[PDB]
Design a protein around this ligand. Structure first.
Ligand SMILES: CC(C)NC(=O)N(C)[C@@H]1CCS(=O)(=O)C1
Length: 150
């Protein structure tokens, strides 16, 4: 019973979380997952400020109200070569990665590693935070409050 959560640098408190190395998070699960990091789904304004500080990914993820990819450098295989906060318009499917926003993080680029999952609750799952540099933090718990996400 294990879940891997790959996380990034934070930019103005905004970071990306990928579950189990594939697009696998529902919108309800995303809100619960950010809550386990004492975080919330970013607003569009918070994501645009993060982009301006250097944030970009090549993966779709939830924010409040939309599914997006922040892009700085045009790349043909990331958001169809667009720059800015690219918004997903048409998709058949419901599961993506997520973005989270931690208001207590540093104001600009914070590329230190994540070493805690502070607000997870008691549960049976081994949850492992995987940083881009490979460093890991694991703890037994749960963060999903909706049965359909388990
Ligand atoms: C170039 C990017 C996609 N590579 C990347 O993120 N990785 C190789 C991951 C670092 C930690 S891991 O989760 O074990 C695999």
């Amino acid at each position: 019973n294990q879940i891997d959560l790959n996380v990034t640098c934070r930019y103005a408190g905004v970071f990306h979380v990928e579950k189990n190395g594939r697009y696998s998070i529902s919108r309800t699960e995303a809100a619960d997952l950010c809550q386990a990091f004492n975080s919330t789904l970013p607003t569009m304004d918070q994501m645009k400020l993060a982009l301006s500080k250097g944030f970009e990914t090549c993966r779709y993820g939830f924010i409040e109200g939309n599914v997006v990819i922040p892009r700085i450098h045009p790349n043909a295989i990331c958001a169809a070569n667009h720059t800015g906060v690219y918004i997903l318009v048409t998709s058949n499917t419901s599961h993506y990665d997520t973005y989270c926003f931690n208001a207590s993080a540093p104001p600009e680029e914070d590329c230190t590693s994540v070493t805690d999952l502070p607000n997870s609750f008691d549960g049976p799952v081994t949850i492992t935070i995987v940083n881009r540099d490979g460093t890991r933090y694991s703890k037994k718990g749960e963060y999903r409050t909706h049965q359909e996400d388990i």
